[PDB]
Design a protein around this ligand. Structure first.
Ligand SMILES: NC(=O)C1=CN([C@@H]2O[C@H](COP(=O)(O)OP(=O)(O)OC[C@H]3O[C@@H](n4cnc5c(N)ncnc54)[C@H](OP(=O)(O)O)[C@@H]3O)[C@@H](O)[C@H]2O)C=CC1
Ligand SMILES: NC(=O)C1=CN([C@@H]2O[C@H](COP(=O)(O)OP(=O)(O)OC[C@H]3O[C@@H](n4cnc5c(N)ncnc54)[C@H](OP(=O)(O)O)[C@@H]3O)[C@@H](O)[C@H]2O)C=CC1
Ligand SMILES: C#CCN(Cc1ccc2[nH]c(N)nc(=O)c2c1)c1ccc(C(=O)N[C@@H](CCC(=O)O)C(=O)O)cc1
Ligand SMILES: C#CCN(Cc1ccc2[nH]c(N)nc(=O)c2c1)c1ccc(C(=O)N[C@H](CCC(=O)O)C(=O)O)cc1
Ligand SMILES: Nc1nc(=O)c2c([nH]1)NCC(CNc1ccc(C(=O)N[C@@H](CCC(=O)O)C(=O)O)cc1)=N2
Ligand SMILES: Nc1nc(=O)c2c([nH]1)NCC(CNc1ccc(C(=O)N[C@@H](CCC(=O)O)C(=O)O)cc1)=N2
Ligand SMILES: O=c1ccn([C@H]2C[C@H](O)[C@@H](COP(=O)(O)O)O2)c(=O)[nH]1
Ligand SMILES: O=c1ccn([C@H]2C[C@H](O)[C@@H](COP(=O)(O)O)O2)c(=O)[nH]1
Lengths: 508, 507
C-alpha cells in the first residue's frame, strides 16, 4: 500500500492557483519546497511519481523533473518510451495503479491542475495535502484549487514567511480514519489524589471546544497561536474576579507569547485589527505627548474613556482638563521623573529622555545588557489617568544584527488590549531598528494578570472558531533620520487579509 | 506475557524502605498512590495481583487488600485454600504463573520486601518501577530497596509534594530493548529557510547536554525549569563579550515556573547557600545599601562590586568602600529618594514601595497593580551596579495564595539565577505570612539569559546529576513587621543536594 498526497499553492482567500497558464506569483522557496517534499523518499532504489494535468505539463515546459517520474493525464498523447521518466495515461482512475505495480515507486503526489485536483479529491484518491497559502489576493485567477472536503483536517501550520514582500504559509491536511499510558495514568491518578495541590491541575490543558483548530496538535507553529492559545488557557483556568471597572474577568497570572518579526508582522488575522490607531498612539508616545485631544483629532478614540471629565473626577483628578491624561507612557518615555503640570506646558529638557538614550545606546553599545525603557514611576502613579500596564521593555541586539524586544505587561486585557500591544511593540522595535541600522528580530511578551472581561466571552469564542491566516508584512516607505518623524503615510501594510472585525466594549 | 511493575517508597539518598517491620514515615498520600496504582486496570472482570514477602504480609495486618489478590511468597506459610483473595507460593519463579493464567489477573505488581525486590530484579522479572522518593535521611533503616539496574531508565519525575513537612516525589522507570509526516516537513522547511525560520534560532538541545535525557514527556520536576533553560542556552547561546573580561553565551527572552505551595525551589543539583541569600534579602528589605553590614555577617557576594578598585573604575571612587549607592534596598524603601552616602538617615525620604505593597496586598488583594520596581533612570549613575532583577509583580489567588512574577534584564545562569529563585521564593513567603496568605507560584522572566564562558565545565557537571525532590522552607514564628525576620526564624527541611560546585563571579 502506498501514499498519495496533493501538493499545491493557492491564494489565501479565493484559492487561486494560476493565471494564463502561469503561477500568479514567483516564490523560490515555494518551488524549493515543492522539490524537497516531492523528492522525499527513503528507498534509494525507488522513485516518486508526480501526476499532473496536461496543461500543467505545458507550464512545466514539458521537460522532466530530476529523480522523479512525471505522469501526464491526457486524452491525446503518445505512450512511447522516448523518455523513461515520463508516462501518459488516458484518465486519472487508471493513472492510479502505481500501487498495483512498480515496487520501484515509493510515494505518489498529485501536482495537479485544477481539473486533476478536483478529481483526485472527488474519487477519494488522495490521503494527504501539502498546501502553501499565499497572501496574494487581489489579482486575476482563472484556475482555483478545489474546496477541501470535510474529510480532511489540518495538522500543521508553519510560521509566516516572506519573499518579495509576499507572505505565505505551509499547511498539511489528512483524512480521518477509524478507531505510553504509564505516564498519563500515573499523572492522572496523582492528580486525583492531590487536587489543586498539584500545580498541573492549576494549569489544565484547554478543552477542545475552546481550543482553536483542535486538529492541529503537534503542528501549532503559526505564532498567532501564541495569542489564541493564551485565550484558551484562561478560558479554561481563568478564575472569576471583580475589579475597579465593575466588569469582572477570568484571570490567570504569569503567561508568555513570542512572535517573529524577521519574516512577518504580528498583526492578528483572526479578527480585523485597526492599525491606524496603534501607530498613531505610538508616535504619540514617542513624542512624549500626553494630550488626548491630539489623538481624538486624528479620529482615534482609544483614550477617550480614561480621559472623560467624570472618570478623572471619579479617580480624584477632577482638576484636569477634559483630556489631560497626566504623566503617562509618553511623558515617562521622554521625561522620566519630570515634574508634571498640565499637558499644555513645555517639557523640553525636563526629566530623563530614555528613548533618546535607548537609541544612542543601541547604536554605540549594542551588546550592552541595559537597553531598558520603563514607564513605572512610583512618584507619579497618582497623577496618571491610569497606571502603566505594559510596564517595562528590554531591547537586545543579536550577533546577526537584529533587534529583539521583551516587554513585561502587568495587566493585559486579552480581547482589546493585547492585540494592540503586540502590534505596537512590534512597530516600535522596527522603528528602533531602522533608526539604529538593524533588522527586526523577535518579540516576546511576558504577562502578569492575563484576563478576559466577561462581556467579551461570546466574541472571543467567535474568534476562536476562525483558523488563522498568514501574517501580513509591514514596511517603511522611507528611511527617516529621527524616530519622532514617522508618519502614517510612511507605513505600508502588505497582504493583510483578516477575518471580520469583532465588536468589543472596553471597560472604563 | 503480562505486565509486571514494582511499587516502592524509599528514602532519597540511602534507599531506606523499612524499620523494625514497619514503614519509616507516615505519608497518607503515598498509600493512596499505592492503592490507586495497584488498583488501576482495564477489564472489570479481571483483577491485579500484588506479590509480597511474608514479613510485608505481616506488617500489612495479614488481611486482604480490597479488589485485588495478594500473593505471599513464603517457605513456611500454610498453602491452605481458605481466602480466595490471598494465595501463597514457595518461591518467586513459581508465582509467575500469574503470567500464564488467571487471565482473571490483568496486571502484576511486586510490592516487595527487600528480599523480594532484590529477586524480582535479579531475575529480569520487572518491566517497570514506580518509585516514591521520600526526603527523609538521618534516621534508622534496616531494610532497603535494591539499586536500580542499568537496564532501567527514568521516564517521569513528578513535582515535589509535601506531607507533614516531608518532601517527596514520584518517579517511573522503564526497561530497555533494542508521524514523521509533520516532522519531515519542518526539517525540509528548515533546510530551505535556515536562520530565517524562527525554529532554527531555538533549536532543541542535543541530548549530550540535556539533563536526564530519558525523561522526555515527564520532566515535571521544576528543577527542570532551570536545568533546561541552562541547556537551552548551551545549544543556542550566541558567543558575546561584555563589560567584564569574561565573554558569555546568551539568548534573549526566557522564562521559568516554580510551585511554592508544596515545596521551596532551592536547587538540588548543586548545593545552594541559602543563608547568604536570606541575609541579602532582609538587607534589601531594610533599605540598607551598606556593603559592610553584609561583609559583617560573612556574606561577600557584594564585595566584588564594592571594592575601591571597582568604584574607581566606574567613576565612583569619590565614596567610601562598600557604599554601593541607591541600589536595590534604597529603591525598595526610598524610591526617588536623594541619595547621599550609606550613612545618612533616609527616614521619610522617597516613596516606600515595600510598605505600599503590603498595604495593597492586604487592603486590596484583587488589585492588578501590586508592583515593586528598582529601575530608576535618574539613579542609575550612582549605583555600583544597575539593577538586574529589575521589577516584580505580586498576585493574590482566589484561594488565598500569593504568587510572584519577576523580570531579570540580565541573568547569570550559573551564579545569579539560583540565588534569584530562592531569594524571591523567600520574599514571597514573607509577604504572604505578613499579609496572611499562603505561598503560590513563582515565575521568572528573563532578558539576557547567559552563561559565562568560565562556567561551562562546571554547569555540564551540574547537568550530569539527576534532580532530587525540593526541600521545604518554614518560618519558626509569625513576625510583626516584615523586617523582623531573622536567620534563626528560618527552617530548611529535607534539603539533600549534590556537592557544591565552585564558580567564579565576573567583576
Ligand atoms: N499553484 C499550484 O500549486 C499549481 C498550479 N497549477 C496551475 O494550474 C493550471 C493548470 O490547471 P488545469 O487547467 O486543470 O490543467 P491541468 O494541468 O489540470 O490539465 C488538464 C488536462 O489533463 C488532461 N485530463 C484532465 N482530465 C482528464 C481526464 N479525466 N481524462 C483524461 N485526461 C484528462 C486533459 O488533457 P488532454 O486534453 O491532453 O487529454 C486536460 O486538458 C496552470 O495554470 C498551472 O499553472 C498547476 C499545478 C500546481
Ligand atoms: N517501603 C516499602 O515500599 C516497603 C517496605 N517494606 C519493608 O520491608 C521489610 C520486609 O522486608 P524483608 O525483611 O526482606 O522481608 P520480606 O517481606 O521480603 O519477606 C521475607 C520472607 O519471605 C519468604 N521468602 C523470601 N525469599 C524467599 C525465597 N527465596 N524462598 C522462599 N521463601 C522466601 C521467607 O519467609 P519464610 O520465612 O516463611 O520462608 C522470608 O522470611 C519490612 O520492614 C517492611 O516494612 C516492605 C514492603 C514495602
Ligand atoms: C492595549 C492598548 C491600547 N488601548 C489603551 C487601553 C486603555 C484602557 C484599557 N482598559 C481596559 N480595561 N482594557 C484595555 O485593553 C484598555 C486599553 C486600547 C484601548 C481601547 C481599545 C479598543 O477598544 N479597541 C477596539 C478598537 C476600536 C477602533 O480602533 O475603532 C478594538 O476592537 O480593538 C484598544 C486598545
Ligand atoms: C544573583 C545574586 C546574588 N549575587 C550578587 C552578584 C553580584 C554580581 C554578579 N556578577 C556576575 N557576573 N554574576 C553574578 O551571579 C553576580 C551576582 C551573588 C554573588 C555571588 C554568588 C556566589 O559566588 N555564590 C557562591 C559562591 C559564594 C559562596 O560560597 O557563598 C556559589 O559558588 O554559588 C552568588 C550570588
Ligand atoms: N506547493 C506547490 N507549489 C507549486 O508551485 C506547485 C505545486 N505545488 N505543484 C505543481 C506545480 C506545477 N508547476 C510547477 C512548476 C515548477 C516546478 C519545478 O520547477 N520543480 C522543480 C523545481 C526545482 C527547484 O525549484 O528547486 C523540482 O525540482 O521539483 C514544479 C511544478 N506547482
Ligand atoms: N510506594 C509504596 N509505598 C509503600 O509504603 C509501600 C509500597 N509502595 N509497597 C508495599 C508496601 C508494604 N506496606 C504496605 C502497607 C500498607 C498497605 C495498605 O494498607 N494499602 C492499602 C492502602 C489504602 C489507602 O491507604 O488508601 C491499599 O488499599 O492498598 C500496603 C502496603 N508499602
Ligand atoms: O496597554 C494597555 C492598557 C491597559 N490594558 C488593560 C489591562 C486591564 O484590563 C486594564 C487596566 O486596568 P488595571 O489592571 O490597572 O486595573 O486595561 C492593557 O491590556 N494594555
Ligand atoms: O541578582 C543578580 C545580580 C547580578 N547577576 C549577574 C548578571 C550578570 O552576570 C552580572 C551583571 O551583568 P550586567 O548585565 O550588569 O553587565 O551579574 C545576576 O545574575 N543576578
Amino acid at each position: 500500500e502506498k501514499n498519495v498526497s496533493i501538493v499545491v499553492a493557492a491564494s489565501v482567500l479565493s484559492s487561486g492557483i494560476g493565471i494564463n497558464g502561469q503561477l500568479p506569483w514567483s516564490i523560490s522557496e515555494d518551488l524549493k519546497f515543492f522539490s524537497k517534499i516531492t523528492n522525499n523518499k527513503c528507498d534509494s532504489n525507488k522513485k516518486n511519481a508526480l501526476i499532473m494535468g496536461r496543461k500543467t505539463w505545458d507550464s512545466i515546459g514539458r521537460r522532466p523533473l530530476k529523480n522523479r517520474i512525471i505522469v501526464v493525464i491526457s486524452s491525446s498523447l503518445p505512450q512511447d518510451e522516448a523518455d523513461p521518466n515520463v508516462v501518459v495515461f488516458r484518465n486519472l482512475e487508471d493513472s492510479i495503479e502505481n500501487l498495483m505495480n512498480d515496487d520501484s515507486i515509493e510515494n505518489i503526489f498529485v501536482c495537479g491542475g485544477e481539473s486533476i485536483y478536483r478529481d483526485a479529491l472527488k474519487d477519494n484518491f488522495v490521503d494527504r495535502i501539502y498546501l502553501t497559502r499565499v497572501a496574494l489576493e487581489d489579482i486575476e485567477f482563472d484556475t482555483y484549487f478545489p474546496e477541501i472536503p470535510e474529510t480532511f483536517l489540518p495538522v500543521y501550520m508553519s510560521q509566516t514567511f516572506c519573499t518579495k514582500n509576499i507572505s505565505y504559509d505551509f499547511m498539511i491536511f489528512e483524512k480521518q480514519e477509524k478507531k505510553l499510558k504509564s505516564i498519563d495514568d500515573t499523572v492522572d491518578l496523582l492528580g486525583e489524589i492531590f487536587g489543586i495541590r498539584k500545580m498541573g491541575n492549576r494549569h489544565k490543558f484547554p478543552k477542545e471546544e475552546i481550543y482553536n483548530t483542535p486538529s492541529i496538535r503537534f503542528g501549532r507553529e503559526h505564532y498567532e497561536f501564541q495569542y489564541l492559545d493564551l485565550l484558551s488557557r484562561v478560558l479554561e483556568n481563568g478564575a472569576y474576579r471583580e475589579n475597579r471597572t465593575g466588569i469582572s474577568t477570568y484571570s490567570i497570572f504569569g503567561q508568555m507569547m513570542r512572535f517573529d518579526m524577521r519574516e512577518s508582522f504580528p498583526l492578528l488575522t483572526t479578527k480585523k485589527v485597526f492599525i491606524r490607531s496603534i501607530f498613531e498612539e505610538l508616535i504619540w508616545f514617542i513624542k512624549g505627548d500626553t494630550n488626548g485631544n491630539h489623538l481624538i483629532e486624528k479620529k482615534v478614540y482609544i483614550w477617550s474613556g480614561n480621559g472623560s471629565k467624570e472618570y478623572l473626577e471619579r479617580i480624584g483628578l477632577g482638576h484636569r482638563e477634559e483630556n489631560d491624561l497626566g504623566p503617562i507612557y509618553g511623558f515617562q518615555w521622554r521625561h522620566y521623573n519630570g515634574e508634571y503640570k498640565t499637558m499644555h506646558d513645555d517639557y523640553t529638557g525636563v526629566g530623563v529622555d530614555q528613548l533618546a538614550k535607548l537609541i544612542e545606546t543601541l547604536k554605540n553599545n549594542p551588546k550592552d545588557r541595559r537597553h531598558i525603557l520603563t514607564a513605572w514611576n512610583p512618584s507619579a502613579l497618582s497623577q496618571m489617568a491610569l497606571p502603566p500596564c505594559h510596564v517595562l521593555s528590554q531591547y537586545y541586539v543579536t550577533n546577526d544584527n537584529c533587534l529583539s524586544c521583551n516587554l513585561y505587561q502587568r495587566s493585559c486585557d486579552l480581547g482589546l488590549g493585547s492585540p494592540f500591544n503586540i502590534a505596537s511593540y512590534a512597530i516600535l522595535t522596527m522603528m528602533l531598528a531602522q533608526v539604529c541600522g538593524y533588522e527586526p528580530g523577535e518579540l516576546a511578551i511576558f504577562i502578569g494578570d492575563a484576563h478576559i472581561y466577561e462581556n467579551h466571552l461570546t466574541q472571543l469564542k467567535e474568534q476562536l472558531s476562525r483558523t488563522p491566516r498568514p501574517f501580513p508584512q509591514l514596511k517603511f516607505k522611507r528611511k527617516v533620520e529621527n524616530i519622532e518623524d514617522f508618519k502614517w503615510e510612511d507605513i505600508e501594510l502588505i497582504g493583510y487579509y483578516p477575518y471580520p472585525t469583532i465588536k468589543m466594549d472596553m471597560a472604563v
